Amino acid sequence: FTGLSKEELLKVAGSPGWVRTRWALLLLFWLGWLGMLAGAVVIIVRAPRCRELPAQKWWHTGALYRIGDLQAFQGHGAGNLAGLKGRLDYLSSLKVKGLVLGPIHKNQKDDVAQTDLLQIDPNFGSKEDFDSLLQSAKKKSIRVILDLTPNYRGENSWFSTQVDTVATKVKDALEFWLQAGVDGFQVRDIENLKDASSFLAEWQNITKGFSEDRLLIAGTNSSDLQQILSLLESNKDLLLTSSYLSDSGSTGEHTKSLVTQYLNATGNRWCSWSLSQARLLTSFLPAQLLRLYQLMLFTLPGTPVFSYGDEIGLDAAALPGQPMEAPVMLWDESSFPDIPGAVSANMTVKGQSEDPGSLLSLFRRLSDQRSKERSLLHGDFHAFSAGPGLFSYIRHWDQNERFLVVLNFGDVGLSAGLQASDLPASASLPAKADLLLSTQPGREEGSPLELERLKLEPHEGLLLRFPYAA
Amino acid sequence: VTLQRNITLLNGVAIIVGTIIGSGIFVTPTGVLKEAGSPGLALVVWAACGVFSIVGALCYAELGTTISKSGGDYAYMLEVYGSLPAFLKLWIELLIIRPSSQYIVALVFATYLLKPLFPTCPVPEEAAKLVACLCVLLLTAVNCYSVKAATRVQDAFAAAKLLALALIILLGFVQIGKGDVSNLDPNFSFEGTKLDVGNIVLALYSGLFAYGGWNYLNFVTEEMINPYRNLPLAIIISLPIVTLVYVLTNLAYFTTLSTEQMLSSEAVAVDFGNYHLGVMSWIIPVFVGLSCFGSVNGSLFTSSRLFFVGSREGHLPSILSMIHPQLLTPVPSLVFTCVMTLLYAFSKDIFSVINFFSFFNWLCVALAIIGMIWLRHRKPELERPIKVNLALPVFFILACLFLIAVSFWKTPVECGIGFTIILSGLPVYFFGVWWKNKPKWLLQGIFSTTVLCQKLMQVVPQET
Ligand SMILES: *[C@@H]1O[C@H](CO)[C@@H](O[C@@H]2O[C@H](CO)[C@@H](O)[C@H](O)[C@H]2NC(C)=O)[C@H](O)[C@H]1NC(C)=O
Ligand SMILES: *[C@@H]1O[C@H](CO)[C@@H](O[C@@H]2O[C@H](CO)[C@@H](O)[C@H](O)[C@H]2NC(C)=O)[C@H](O)[C@H]1NC(C)=O
Ligand SMILES: *[C@@H]1O[C@H](CO)[C@@H](O[C@@H]2O[C@H](CO)[C@@H](O)[C@H](O)[C@H]2NC(C)=O)[C@H](O)[C@H]1NC(C)=O
Ligand SMILES: *[C@@H]1O[C@H](CO)[C@@H](O[C@@H]2O[C@H](CO)[C@@H](O)[C@H](O)[C@H]2NC(C)=O)[C@H](O)[C@H]1NC(C)=O
Ligand SMILES: CC(C)C[C@H](N)C(=O)O
């Protein structure tokens, strides 16, 4: 209606030049499409590839919980172990991937003959309740680790002279509990055992032969780096916890040196980060440093290990009369009716359950971040120099969201005083990054902050996060 | 020189399925789960979306049977309300709503096709953009080449995606039958935002987006053999199958992946394939890409037909709606649609914005049903082969106002912006339609441009 009709177009657009132009345009379009495809292929091939998948085990995902004694953990009426099923929801809230359970085998003080590794103590429960607990834990996706200390009641944990008979009985109990359905084993006081290295090697070999998803935990009170390295000469897939990191109580650079030396000697292998084997966090640290150490342990490249009640900062000195080895858990305000004393929300599970500035909330957030982030899962470690009393390092796996952690062990405020000194160019820190949390309330979240003039309050921790770049 | 009458019942059913099944089923579950949490809440939300879509499809089938004119959802409003509302809808239809679904589907296809090469590290965006552009160009070329070829491609890809969904359902059922349970029995454990209607409508937005394209057959009517019997039959054959497939796939998803791992994941299909296969796990992204390819191919046809029919009323330049001899295809409309779709490549993330203008999209449907009931009431003379019992359109409009009231109660400034955009079509309308006796220098200029395009593309005006 606003152009040439059919006959007019037929008469006009009949010249050979027009059909040649149409043919040329069609050819140009097709070659342009081919060139676009070739450019896409070129941009595909000239690109870095994904790095790898480490294929980590189940215990590489999250932290481990050491129940230890059962009576103190659940207060009165804790004799039956099936009652721990009612506490499994608490562990799921804590989202722990393991559970170190205390010794249950029959043991009458130092009576070697009266010590069966297959007999469950009547006060603790029965085999059927143990199987029910295992089934419930598997349903909730929490593994169970059982301790086999030959003497958990006497002063000598290895029955003194008796070495061959106890070795044979725990060797049999290995297969017995492995076919029972356990997920890992733990022993303690190895330093008090004669020529124990061969025993640990044999037990680790048996456990690995039974299955690939099994564990073996060893605990000693030796803080000598050389001794720990010697104990790891014949074994490399063994998780050992000791007092090497503890009993320092000094500046942050000392801890940095200790960690760097341990990583250098081990060879960037997989390790376990724990203050001690059976002691609480408060047993060696003041109340002002618990949050800093909790932040540090959840970011180091290893498997963190905690004792029961240390997520709420339980202290044994307070509420006197409780033995330091097995302090009672403070569930609620009435969790300790036997011993009247200090009762408040700052030191109860339900009291801290709603406080956003409490230890429990920080513990839950840190556990979630550790269990949900790939860089915190199997990233790399790089520590650079900082101010006199500041510990700083970064985590990054291949290309995911990077992490930066800065801690101030000093008791006075100071500036950042940091330089790049970064070996991986792909992990070079930019000037802009977000903030996740701090141990001291009074800061905002998610604000892109300059990474040059950080002012650190006494006993402060930071969780800088920056995205991947070139 | 009419276009053709070639679409059969099978072709229409295949078109519907291909269009309705694109990429929502493989993306929207994560968003709807984050916005609902409770698997039972998500399942009932999807069921409500399915029944709402079935209601709308039945009402639109009735309307299309009543008015046998091409370009649905726009010809009806032109017939009932006049000229201003129709052009007001079309002006934003050809700018925002239409040239956004095709680009998003193509981008999803490109991203999922290259997933096996980059399993962990994310794919570069430039390669995805290039692949999407290549897909759009190839699809518009094959659509322009012929009509039968497009139908054959649509049927082939619909069959492929149906087989893929059947395989997914079979794998889910096998996993269920192995003797393993999950949180499905103790559902509704979290049930957060139960009283917060804002999150409910937010999830319903994604659910309805996953159900989009249910009314695209009305656009391509007047081109299918015996529409009076084939259209409602095709709609009633297609819609319940889509609803059943969606609900079954949603059920089969949860039996394998936990809630937390589903929420934390970014490609639920990839995780499902990796878990259930381990090796040869690259089948799922390939099938997803094929489904998206079929969906965008289906959408382009309807968009081209809608632009064709609109230009016959003078709302668009006469260069459009200009058929080509020999092979009967609307080349200028397809070229315009392709070039407008490509123009969105110069944009950042657009998915977050796709929820924008959904209020107007569901508003126009409501006015269409109001026009239908108006015609049924005050014009009892048109021959209606199909008659729908009342209170069904009433329930549809009541749901429409329920959905539209929340969009005003919350996020009102983000609606006022956008609403100002739809109103911006008044000056262009008054310049291009209402205006007459314009200065002549423009007249021979546009005439010469139209003649140049006429000669360049060698097309014919719509004589009959
Ligand atoms: C330990 O298990 C392995 C495999 O069943 C065997 O020994 C391993 O391989 C060689 C050959 O004996 C040794 O030199 C390695 O030290 C062993 N690997 C380990 C211990 O991880 C053998 O069956 C077992 N050997 C002993 C001493 O228990
Ligand atoms: C663990 O603590 C005990 C308690 O003091 C210490 O073990 C000492 O070991 C030496 C030889 O290794 C022996 O004289 C005794 O067995 C212990 N000495 C005592 C009781 O005075 C030591 O501090 C720790 N054990 C280590 C590091 O192997
Ligand atoms: C322990 O000391 C250093 C501390 O890292 C280890 O690494 C050496 O130092 C440079 C500089 O950091 C590294 O780049 C090299 O890998 C090492 N240089 C050498 C070995 O010459 C060092 O390997 C350790 N020393 C030991 C194990 O004897
Ligand atoms: C909660 O935290 C601790 C115990 O968990 C307590 O800290 C007290 O703080 C007051 C004033 O800050 C000081 O007298 C002592 O540092 C603490 N007193 C006692 C009796 O423990 C206290 O229960 C709570 N902290 C408060 C209220 O700041
Ligand atoms: C609106 C349509 C483009 C959505 C389509 N059903 C898809 O999920 O791909």
Author numbering:
A (entry chain A): 162 to 631
B (entry chain B): 44 to 507
Quote the study's own text.
The LAT1–4F2hc complex is a representative member of the Heteromeric Amino Acid Transporter (HAT) family, composed of light and heavy subunits from the SLC7 and SLC3 families, respectively.
In contrast, the HAT + Leu complex exhibits a fully occluded conformation, with Phe252 completely covering the Leu substrate. Leu interacts primarily with unwound regions of TM1 and TM6 via hydrogen bonds to Ile63, Gly65, Ser66, Gly67, and Gly255, stabilizing its position in the binding pocket. A further hydrogen bond between Ser338 and Leu’s carboxyl group enhances binding affinity. LAT1 bound to Leu adopts a fully occluded conformation, whereas LAT1 bound to Tyr and Diiodo-L-Tyrosine represent intermediate states, transitioning from outward-facing occluded to outward-open conformations. While the residues involved in Leu coordination are conserved between the two transporters, those coordinating Trp differ.
